[PDB]
Amino acid sequence: SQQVDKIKASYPLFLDQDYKDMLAKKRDGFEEKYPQDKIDEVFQWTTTKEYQELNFQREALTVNPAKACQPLGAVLCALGFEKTMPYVHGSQGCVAYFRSYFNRHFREPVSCVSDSMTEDAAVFGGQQNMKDGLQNCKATYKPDMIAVSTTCMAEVIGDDLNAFINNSKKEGFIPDEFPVPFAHTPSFVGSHVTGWDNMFEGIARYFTLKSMDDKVVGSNKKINIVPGFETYLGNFRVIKRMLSEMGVGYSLLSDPEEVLDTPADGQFRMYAGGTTQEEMKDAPNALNTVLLQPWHLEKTKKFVEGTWKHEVPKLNIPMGLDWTDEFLMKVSEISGQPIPASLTKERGRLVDMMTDSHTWLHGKRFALWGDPDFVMGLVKFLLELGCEPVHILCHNGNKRWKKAVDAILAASPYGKNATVYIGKDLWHLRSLVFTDKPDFMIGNSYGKFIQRDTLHKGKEFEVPLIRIGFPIFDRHHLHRSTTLGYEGAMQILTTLVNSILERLDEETRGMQATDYNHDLVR
Amino acid sequence: SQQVDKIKASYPLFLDQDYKDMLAKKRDGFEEKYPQDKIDEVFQWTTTKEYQELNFQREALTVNPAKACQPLGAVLCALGFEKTMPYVHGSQGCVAYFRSYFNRHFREPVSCVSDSMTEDAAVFGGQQNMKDGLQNCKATYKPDMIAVSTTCMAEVIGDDLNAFINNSKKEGFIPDEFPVPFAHTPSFVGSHVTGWDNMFEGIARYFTLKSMDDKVVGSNKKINIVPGFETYLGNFRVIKRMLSEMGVGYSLLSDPEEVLDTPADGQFRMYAGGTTQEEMKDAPNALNTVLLQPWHLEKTKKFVEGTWKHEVPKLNIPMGLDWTDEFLMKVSEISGQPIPASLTKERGRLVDMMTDSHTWLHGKRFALWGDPDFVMGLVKFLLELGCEPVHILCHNGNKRWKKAVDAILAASPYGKNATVYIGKDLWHLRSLVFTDKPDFMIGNSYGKFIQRDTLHKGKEFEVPLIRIGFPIFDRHHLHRSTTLGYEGAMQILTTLVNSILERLDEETRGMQATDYNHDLVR
Amino acid sequence: MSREEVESLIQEVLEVYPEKARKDRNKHLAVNDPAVTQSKKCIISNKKSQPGLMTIRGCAYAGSKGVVWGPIKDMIHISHGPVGCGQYSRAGRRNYYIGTTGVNAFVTMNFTSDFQEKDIVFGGDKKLAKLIDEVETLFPLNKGISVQSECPIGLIGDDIESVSKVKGAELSKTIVPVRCEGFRGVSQSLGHHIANDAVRDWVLGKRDEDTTFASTPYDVAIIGDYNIGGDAWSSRILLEEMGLRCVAQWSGDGSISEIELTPKVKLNLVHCYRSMNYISRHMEEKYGIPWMEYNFFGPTKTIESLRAIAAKFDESIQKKCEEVIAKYKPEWEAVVAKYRPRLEGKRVMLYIGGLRPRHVIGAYEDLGMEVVGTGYEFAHNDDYDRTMKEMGDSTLLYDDVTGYEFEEFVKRIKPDLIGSGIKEKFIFQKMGIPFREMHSWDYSGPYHGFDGFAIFARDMDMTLNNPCWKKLQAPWEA
Amino acid sequence: MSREEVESLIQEVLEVYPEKARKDRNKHLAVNDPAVTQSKKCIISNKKSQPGLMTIRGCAYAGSKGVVWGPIKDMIHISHGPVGCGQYSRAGRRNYYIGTTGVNAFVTMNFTSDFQEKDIVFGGDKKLAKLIDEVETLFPLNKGISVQSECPIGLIGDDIESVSKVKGAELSKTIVPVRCEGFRGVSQSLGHHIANDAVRDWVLGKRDEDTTFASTPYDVAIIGDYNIGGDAWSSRILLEEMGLRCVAQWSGDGSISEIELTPKVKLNLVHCYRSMNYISRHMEEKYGIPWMEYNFFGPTKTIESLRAIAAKFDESIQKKCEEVIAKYKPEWEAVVAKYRPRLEGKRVMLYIGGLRPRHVIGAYEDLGMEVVGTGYEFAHNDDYDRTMKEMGDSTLLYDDVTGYEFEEFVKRIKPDLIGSGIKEKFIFQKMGIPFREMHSWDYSGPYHGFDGFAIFARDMDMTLNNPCWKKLQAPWE
Ligand code: ICS
Ligand code: CLF
């Protein structure tokens, strides 16, 4: 039943007595459910250290992974170029999923096409699919560029992207001069960040490999910036802003910031902003190329160093105080521009916030996960704050990255109780936060389920989730935040300290029980 | 007892069994406490409508007010001028309290001096205190200006600020040319915003009243901006940024943004930034003066219109979509500068966020309080979002402001269930949120206590607090936020929608009870 | 618009396509004629999507794992293959359930074999067996395992049926291999068919020789309701208030036990014909269980469906049906009285997967709202046959509409409201047109039954009449 | 720094003042000589603040309402006057208590008469009576009312004593008028004295003719502990583990009933001498209750205080004291072993109100830390007498220090840590010097007793050795 003045959605409509009785009847009559005591016993067992030992012995089963597949990152990279259509050669279900994923994270339209490879192409290949798809996409959506990636079906079949695109141009399906960069993005290798790397390397190669004769390093007085797989629009914006304050000429290659933040003004813009083809063609003429996320831009680094002859600096992700300082100093050295007073004042204000919040931040234990560069920057910043990143999970991390993070942890007294896990999923992390409980979790929306599980053990065992990373589905407009630079450091610090204070307020809100510590001033 | 590896602060140290037993012994033996059943009965009574009727019949008693006294606002206004020392003629306890209040809200040094008026001055007055204090302050802290306000003691005994300062200059305690603007700020009239208005009018009078002969309106191509009592640094920053994007010459009079956000770089800066004396002297030459918070800038408006001959536009606080649009259009009309494409895109992005979050924001009921202009801007924005501001409290509001807010509410279907209260404190609001429960509260840190009270009635009766306003003591760095303009509207929208989503996640986190609605995607 | 105007609009939109794409897409767009009963004379459906045209269709894995098998709560579903397919489909569909997640319920979890390069090169059958052993170790309370194949499984020659047979015999566990590789078929529809076949071959006949279940003459099974936001619970409360006993729910909040008990029911009540007509026909042909389609969208369709269902039983069920209708009449009448004046005359364009584009029309009309355009991602011609009589005359019908086509149709028709998926929501919101997610109910609901109708009316009003839609034009641009 | 260097620093700092201010401030700065017992020979205190020098001192209202009367939980305290004084002091002090706020406890609430212009012009006695009636209506479980006067009350000629008497007789309620107007005195110290006098005249003698309370030979009262972060509870658990019965706590987590029962105790244990020595002397002279000062800051002072207190009782109390000391020895020894190596040799400067500048020195020394400068906002010369022997030789002593003076002293001395209030915290944090709030314990604590020592050591280590202090210099500067 519903009262028209106060209509109930599913929660709390299904908490009504009639719905409770009907659900109980269903369960008792037809579900053959295990007894509640057995369910409680099994849950308690899953919270134990023996279950953790069994869980970490997994070799074939993956439960709740913390990574996606390559073509997602390829699509995100392709979206960063001017009037460019992402085109995934393969089956259409992949493109539907990619678009839904990005739509839910960004709350924006995400344009991407498929050539709809089916059982017919499973034997003969998708050459005809490629020809028809390129022609149809160019005719219908009118892009200036079509950036081609692949699904797992095309990779397993062994479709030659280069030959297929060349045949499409040779038979007149698309004009010869039309730019169609391509990249093989096998979903069974790496993760979404690997797809971003492969797509960017393919685009850069397409635009620069055959015209290196007239290129002179440093002849345009600019610095190339490659952001990598990035889902915070504030990060693109802060990098561009910081480079503009220094008066440093720059080219942000793969800039999807405009197309992912189009205004609602009565018209739909399929394309907006992005790196131009002229910018990519002129990229070898830059002074140098800076990779914002070097740990998943290794193929891009190899191409840039071997072909453009750019001496790519060994820089960490500009996250937190020290690494933002190093990024700014390296940019100053490359460009010859001094670091302005505005950036010095911004750094000082970040340090002031650190000194203001250090008492609440000190000693706090964290479990965190995400992409390798983001996770490493978060660990570095947490160490700078006096926090303890006790659990550091990176499902798509490798051994060299783990060694680098271990070196970072060993350099700080606050990394003593920290452990880095690679190839582990969020079920491993659930076991870790049960057996060795941290104060908070930092990660994407999937960690919310872990929080629920911890709350099921008890309020004192609950590990609250702090939503930083990708994807964030259960909150609105967090994709507008910043994690890079001093601005991103201040935002992360504010989020952390206020999460701590919110948790303390919740724990001390009990009248005459714990509210003696419900302080007005914190 | 304490374990050295895990040291407990007061919470949860006093939840240990020995401390619980000792507290119970103290209560049972010596406190003569009322029985717990009587306490529960009285609390339940205080949650009722009969108690609300008794509570709203108050004529003499004020409980938990939502306002401060005038000299606090006078000090905040004085802090907005270059190398200016706030100087409160009266007793020193007032200055200690003002400094502590602002220190806790801003987490920054707050410089303010007193002439330490004692029982000796309670009969003869504080003329000698004024002379010695002006001399000592100028000699010791070396300001370029001393802005003088008053405490209630000096107002009650009737100290003549003008005569005292003139005598100080006549006897050589301070140079004649040294600027000493003054304002009477009686704490028994108005509130802190009235003190801000009085101090600004005093400073503007001091710098412009006797030199109006050579002034020509509009001869410097600038627009004067008077922000009023403002405790969000982001508001100053966003006003300056928006005016800079339009290419509009402006003078922000009383700009305390720099001195309240000094960097931590190894040195203490008592003064930083601020409106210069030349800016104040040249103010009558502006095209016009725009008052950001007109409902507590009435004396300033009277002076600006009657002396500077500026046709001050009738503008609301630039909060939310419609009022930011009106502010920008009026600025464009006054300055002749078109509204640039960047601001149009920013407005469109705010509208896009509104369309993205409207489903979660629609129909939500709010109790809110604060200063009149901030409260009315928040009400306007909530109406634009489809929310219901059911309780609108303004302790320092007047009847004309209440009439204006009622007119705003009548213009929207979402203001049907809204009631505006003036002269009511937070105990009245506690009664209101008990008897007519809203979904959320928007206000300063004091509302946290109300939240605690609601949680004591039950989890289903708890009204969570959303911290927007002044002062915010239990969270860190929220004073850096923005509430004005499109940027402030986006920040407020994000805070509101994510508070709603956090509450929904908390309510649906119960495993096998309510977690059927614990959706990954919201 | 008149019929000629709609035809001209269709031709103008098709003008941009190449000749082959235009020729193919001309067959998937039509002007509705309610008198037509054979929709293949006017529209063609269930065909291959044209390459590179930004289709909204999914894959067979989405239709099998994400739609049919996934909602089954006490079973563990393995996305066999690389990580992407399982990751993108994890908890994206609001098929609600009651259970302890990770202990006895596993709907919102993502189990995957996470194929690497070596699994592609050398196969993943041994990996699948080891994964099944690890699943048994770490989740002892699971009541069954399904293995949903992703694209590489059918291309590398893996034999998941033999692995399922061997491991099920060894562990005495039901292990259901589903060959739902994404490249199979043209959309989620073949995923529905493959999942139905897997249910038939591996689960449904488990209790054929079991007679311990005590059957009653009022035994019904809800087939094809996936409890989106609790829709199946809202339907079930009405059915049980009518005196019926709902033995099974397929498959929202569904357990494997009630699926096995379904062949014992007296009637099958099919909500989604598209996804479960195969298993309904199989049960009719094998166990002799009649099945009937019903619609619980809006009070009118709900009342008609309740009366039709009660007509299949004795007089006591009919009397209880009349009592239920009388009880719920004031509530939905109050909902109509409140919300129809705010929504009367508004025009709606819908584009959903395979059932709802025709099922929600009655609910929209109960609020005085006119559906001027509708279409399906993956419906067959029988769905369009059912759609002709529900749609108004000279209304627009689209099958597997492209993004460009939908945008142009919306530009010309200019509906007051659009109901589609997440991939069109922000496109049409940026155009200044109110949008309602008709898959996930915009994270609201349920919409089935009278309790669902109240929420449906509230949501349509809150989105269509939101102030935000009057603010898209800056006052210096009116 | 040697004595001559400290004197030269004092003179250099004083150079900036005008002649009158310099002459006055020269008497409030000194170089410590531990052999000196009469501190008035070297430093002068409890004087008027110099105008316009940014003093840190508060007012008599802060010393009475904010310090003494406010912590009393079952009483309602009316800030009589305009809204500001009550608003700024609301819940700013962490005097912890147990109760149901708004029902039977009212510490964190702000009750005020909210004086308007008409109240100033025509008086507020009728408003005060109406307010008392409304308080009785809306808060029936309050066990007493105090009326803390703000500045205008003593200037407009209001008679709150007559109103208090009439309303108390009418309602059979204890109504305590406190003439704590801010202009009275020079600091919070006169507020302490006025509040003590109000307690003496209106509350303390309520049960003089009552003999129903069952007294024991081990009855003690805790006087001058305000339960900052639970400090009084940490002291009380130790006292009761020693076999004593803590009848009253003054005034943190304090009720009016235990204040009335205080004249029945056998011993008074005064923590804050500055704020409650008046009432301690009154109780000694009237009821014959001896009072003794004790210090629970740090294990050494805590052990010495426990032994001294137990020496006032029989042998059973002494045996229980030895048992308590033995029980708690491993815990504070582990705390020292963990944190002293991180803090050994660090130099700290303190500036707090009237007790803690000398009381916390032992706790710092237990961690190997050296206090090189100390000073008081409002202490008297007896406090400095007690401070001489606790401070090291050639250390700096400052009374009512100005912001400029403190900044210059910190610039020259360069301590590793500064302990002061909220009005100096951000100044010294921006200078790159770790700062600990020594009033509110930086919203941490308690610091009293053995349990408080662990928190104190952890906090000092976390602030002094925080990484943030090594990052204030940009690497390009
Ligand atoms: S009462 Fe005094 S200023 Fe003795 S007014 Fe002040 S809670 Fe200080 S050094 Mo704040 S004489 Fe208490 C004090 Fe000491 S408020 Fe607290 S810390 S031990
Ligand atoms: S049509 Fe369907 S969703 Fe596509 S793969 Fe095939 S079953 Fe799956 Fe999977 S990991 Fe990523 S998302 Fe693909 S490229 Fe492969």
Ligand code: CLF
């Ligand atoms: S020294 Fe002390 S705090 Fe000052 S007034 Fe006097 S009792 Fe009070 Fe009060 S309302 Fe504001 S803060 Fe004053 S100007 Fe008056």
Ligand SMILES: [Fe+3]
């Ligand atoms: Fe959006």
